[PDB]
Design a protein around this ligand. Structure first.
Ligand SMILES: Nc1ncnc2c1ncn2[C@@H]1O[C@H](COP(=O)(O)OP(=O)(O)O)[C@@H](O)[C@H]1O
Lengths: 328, 306, 307
């Protein structure tokens, strides 16, 4: 039977035939069949069969030859050349080898920290509809590991996500938003350290999502802003964000949106500007100029939502706070 | 052909069905750039909670992982104002249920049921090999084209058996948004205990669907859901209505069809045959002609939409 | 014997008894979903110290928390004529204490204990990020679903931090005495709330891996005198990686005691543990001896004949 070193050499050479295809289709069909057969032969070493479970020596030899040969970089780079069922086999091989451990070490994360281009070639795959779904699966498995999430967050390429969450093909745009949310919410201290050092650039892009003409982009981005501000790891971001008059002027416009869902999500962020001790004078000037308009509005705001007791306590507290404002 | 993700390109012509909770409208439409006829499914997302919007996004992931001749292909997906729009090719005979409600009110012919259930088992054999459990196999989710091809279409209900990279032996998730599906679910899905369920749960729903196509009405039709749960738990199994089982009693089904429905509907899930084992069963060996030659003739009382 | 309907729910048989009342199985008669209900007699709530305020607080917290490792509230139903309240909850098969009582050594294999401890730390990091301090972490308040997912349950004793407070400082001593830190036993005026839960998760990991308690006493005064001394031992069958983690938790001074970060970064936490021994199963139903713990509702369906 063939070894891992034979199978890695087979798949390496058949990929190198697909790379050019200067010879006619009679060679390309053979090369495509070889790539398909050798991707199943690799997956049988990693996942086994019901009568013959994975053997730890074969997995160790396969994982080492996939570092030695550079074939993990080649399969990610040339993923467009592979057939439909074969592209799912590359994602299933990649995720299994990424979860490998040697005691407390993860040796595939130690590998990807050199040849970091694997992470950027997966992120670039959102621009190619025939590979975007498989690139998204592999990329979400990478960002489970804090060194790989850190390479992506601290890169000039991260700001491409503000294009990818607005694409017209909704099954790709919603997969890009799932990857974007996981980077910001999984590793709490890394995300808080990023949001401090990149505050002025990140929130200058994020306000454009709150102005989006796509309903689902507008709805999901305003939900996530409330979850980023209420998290106690982000307290220094939250107290800085609510100190800006531009950020209150936006939340008082979103309270008047035609969507009941956008109005209700905006209320749960607006609440935090008024409930704040130690307000800065620009916020007090805004609320003093709007005092009667806000009291009249909050007395009418979603009164048919009678099932919720804490919503009525918060409305009552806000109307009291807006009556208790003192003139300069 | 590629379909543009813009709401202006489609002329909506008529309503052909409804679904989800009661939020989905299904329309026949004309694609203006070519004149091709298509199905558009529309859901107003302002009527949806954040759980319902997340449940609709899972269907769009699964419908991209599958490529099989007997599973419905999705042509485009986009947002227009408040509404999620999904586009597919149009199946000119509708669902197998639409045929029963219009032209086959006392049940279908045995050879037409053989062509339909062979196409359904070919789609399930792919889905079970991919590591998924379909849920809601029912006669509303089986669609038929003008050239007699049969498609399975219930993909919103599907669950993966893969967890943390491992294919699990059984799963325990009770199916969400499933009130209209409860008659077709197996006893081991409804029990919600430490046993769990697996891919053998669809082989029960194929047996309930085979009874529905043959009898023209579903098993457990008039029952409150709690009475149907009691009859499932006490072990009541539904079967074919013909002159051997007892106005329409001037027929018999073959002993092969009676044996097929009894290999499905078994109480022990491990005694049920797999989808690849059922495709070898002697019930299907009465199929001689090609499906695209025979099925339009077996449906001769019907007019297809053109 | 006889069916009773409460809103859309059909009443089943007894699952146990909590700190405030009976717990029963119920069936949603519209969707057939299997649920649990906590029954709160208002006559009894006003006999328990702050019981009516604790039930109101527990409902207000459970309406706003959503995580894979924290219990879910489904409905609250009232019967003002009979003076009752019902909380309808997600169904869980048993608590972690019922499994530990079901084996003679009262412990789990290291491979099984690690799998529950990672789910506890995922649930605590959620609760702490939301500003909730759960003062009563112990195996009696950790519940298992049929899929083997762990749920943190009894939020009645918990404290919620004010949104604009810069740190987790807490005032009030509450919860199970055997799981409390020296800060509580010495009766201090102020302490870090998050560092109390790390001690209670430390006594939990010590107990489920060792089958013992680090501190003991015949009554509350002797128990708090023994906790206030801060001194305990770790047995000889305890491995060096686990013994170090159980010394970073269970540390006398709150500034030296581990954070959730130092727990997730520890060698015993990040290691992969082999299945060297058979895991402890969920025990069979205590009365009927049913190994699958199936629904009790069938003799109630046979009274109602549908509906
Ligand atoms: N592409 C299609 N071509 C023809 N009829 C269709 C098509 N898609 C749906 N239908 C019709 O619409 C009905 C409802 O769609 P379905 O997918 O079953 O909705 P749901 O699962 O939400 O209940 C079908 O049973 C059938 O009558």
């Amino acid at each position: 039977h063939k070894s891992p070193a034979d199978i890695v050499k087979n798949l390496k050479e058949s990929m190198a035939v697909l790379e050019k295809q200067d010879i006619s289709d009679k060679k390309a069909e053979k090369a495509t069949e070889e790539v398909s057969k050798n991707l199943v032969a690799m997956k049988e070493i990693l996942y086994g069969t019901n009568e013959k479970e994975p053997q730890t020596e074969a997995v160790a030899q396969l994982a080492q030859e996939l570092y030695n040969s550079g074939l993990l970089s080649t399969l990610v780079a040339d993923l467009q050349l592979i057939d439909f069922e074969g592209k799912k086999d590359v994602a299933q091989i990649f995720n299994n080898i990424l979860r490998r451990q040697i005691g407390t070490r993860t040796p595939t994360v130690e590998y990807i920290c050199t040849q970091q281009n694997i992470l950027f070639m997966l992120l670039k795959g959102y621009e190619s509809p025939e590979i975007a779904l498989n690139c998204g699966i592999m990329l979400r498995e990478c960002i489970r590991h804090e060194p790989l999430a850190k390479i992506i967050l601290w890169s000039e390429q991260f700001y491409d996500f503000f294009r990818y969450v607005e694409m017209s093909t909704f099954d790709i745009a919603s997969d890009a938003f799932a990857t974007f949310k996981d980077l910001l919410t999984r590793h709490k201290l890394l995300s808080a350290e990023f949001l401090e050092q990149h505050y002025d650039r990140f929130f200058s892009e994020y306000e454009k999502l709150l102005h989006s003409e796509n309903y689902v982009t507008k709805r999901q981005s305003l939900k996530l802003l409330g979850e980023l501000l209420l998290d106690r790891h982000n307290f220094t971001i939250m107290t800085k964000y609510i100190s800006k008059p531009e950020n209150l002027k936006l939340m008082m416009n979103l309270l008047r949106d035609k969507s009941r869902n956008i109005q209700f999500e905006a209320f749960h962020v607006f609440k935090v500007f008024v409930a704040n001790p130690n307000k800065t004078q620009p916020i007090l000037d805004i609320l003093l100029k709007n005092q009667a308009k806000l009291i009249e509005f909050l007395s009418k705001f979603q009164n048919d939502r009678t099932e919720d007791e804490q919503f009525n306590d918060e409305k009552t507290y806000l109307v009291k706070q807006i009556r208790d404002l003192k003139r300069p | 052909s590629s379909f543009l993700p813009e709401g202006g390109c489609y002329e909506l012509l008529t309503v052909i069905g409804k679904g989800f909770e009661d939020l989905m409208t299904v329309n026949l439409a004309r694609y203006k750039p070519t004149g091709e006829y298509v199905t558009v499914r529309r859901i107003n997302l302002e009527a949806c909670s954040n759980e319902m919007v997340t449940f609709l996004q899972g269907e769009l992931h699964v419908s991209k992982l599958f490529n099989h001749p007997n599973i419905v292909p999705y042509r485009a997906t986009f947002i227009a104002d408040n509404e999620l729009w999904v586009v597919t090719s149009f199946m000119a005979y509708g669902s197998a249920k639409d045929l029963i409600c219009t032209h086959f009110m006392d049940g279908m012919n045995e050879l037409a049921i053989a062509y339909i259930l062979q196409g359904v088992l070919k789609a399930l054999d792919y889905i079970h090999h991919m590591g998924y459990v379909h849920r809601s196999v029912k006669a509303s989710h089986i669609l038929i084209s003008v050239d007699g091809k049969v498609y399975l279409s219930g993909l919103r209900s599907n669950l993966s058996m893969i967890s943390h990279g491992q294919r699990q032996r059984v799963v325990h998730d009770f199916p969400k948004y499933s009130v209209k599906v409860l008659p077709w679910l197996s006893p081991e899905v409804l029990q919600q205990n430490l046993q769990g369920y697996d891919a053998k749960s669809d082989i029960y729903s194929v047996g309930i669907t085979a009874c529905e196509l043959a009898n023209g009405h579903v098993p457990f039709k008039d029952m409150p859901a709690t009475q149907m749960l009691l009859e499932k738990l006490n072990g009541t199994v539904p079967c074919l209505l013909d002159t051997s089982t007892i106005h329409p009693y001037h027929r018999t089904f073959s002993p092969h069809f009676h044996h097929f429905v009894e290999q499905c509907l078994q109480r022990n899930p491990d005694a049920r045959p797999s989808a690849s084992t059922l495709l070898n069963h002697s019930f299907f060996k009465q199929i001689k002609r090609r499906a695209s030659e025979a099925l339009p003739e077996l449906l001769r009382p019907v007019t297809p939409i053109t | 014997k006889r069916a009773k309907l409460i809103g859309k729910y059909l009443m089943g048989d007894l699952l146990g008894e909590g700190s405030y009342g009976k717990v029963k199985e119920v069936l949603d008669s519209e969707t057939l979903c299997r649920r649990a209900v906590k029954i709160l007699k208002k006559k009894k709530l006003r006999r328990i110290p702050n019981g009516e305020a604790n039930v109101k607080k527990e409902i207000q917290l459970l309406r706003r928390l959503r995580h894979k490792n924290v219990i879910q509230l489904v409905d609250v139903l009232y019967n003002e004529e009979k003076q009752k309240m019902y909380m309808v909850m997600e169904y869980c098969v048993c608590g972690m204490q019922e499994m530990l009582d079901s084996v003679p050594e009262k412990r789990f294999p290291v491979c099984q204990a690690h799998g529950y401890f990672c789910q506890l730390i995922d649930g605590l990091e959620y609760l702490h990020s939301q500003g909730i301090v759960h003062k009563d972490i112990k195996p009696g308040n950790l519940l298992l679903t049929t899929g083997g997912t762990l749920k943190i349950s009894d939020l009645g004793v918990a404290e919620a931090l004010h949104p604009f407070a810069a740190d987790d400082t807490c005032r009030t001593s509450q919860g199970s005495p055997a799981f409390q830190p020296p800060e509580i036993a010495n009766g201090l005026d102020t302490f870090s709330g998050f560092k109390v839960d790390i001690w209670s998760a430390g006594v939990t990991l010590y107990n489920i891996t060792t089958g013992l308690y680090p501190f003991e006493g015949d009554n509350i005064y002797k128990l708090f005198e023994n906790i206030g001394k801060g001194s305990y031992a770790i047995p000889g069958d305890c491995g060096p990686p686990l013994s170090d983690l159980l010394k970073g938790m269970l540390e006398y001074e709150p500034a030296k005691r581990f954070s959730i970060r130092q727990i997730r970064q520890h060698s015993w936490f990040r290691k992969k543990h082999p299945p060297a021994e058979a895991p402890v199963p969920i025990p069979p139903s205590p009365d009927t001896k049913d190994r699958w713990r199936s629904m009790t509702v069938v003799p109630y369906l046979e009274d109602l004949h549908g509906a």
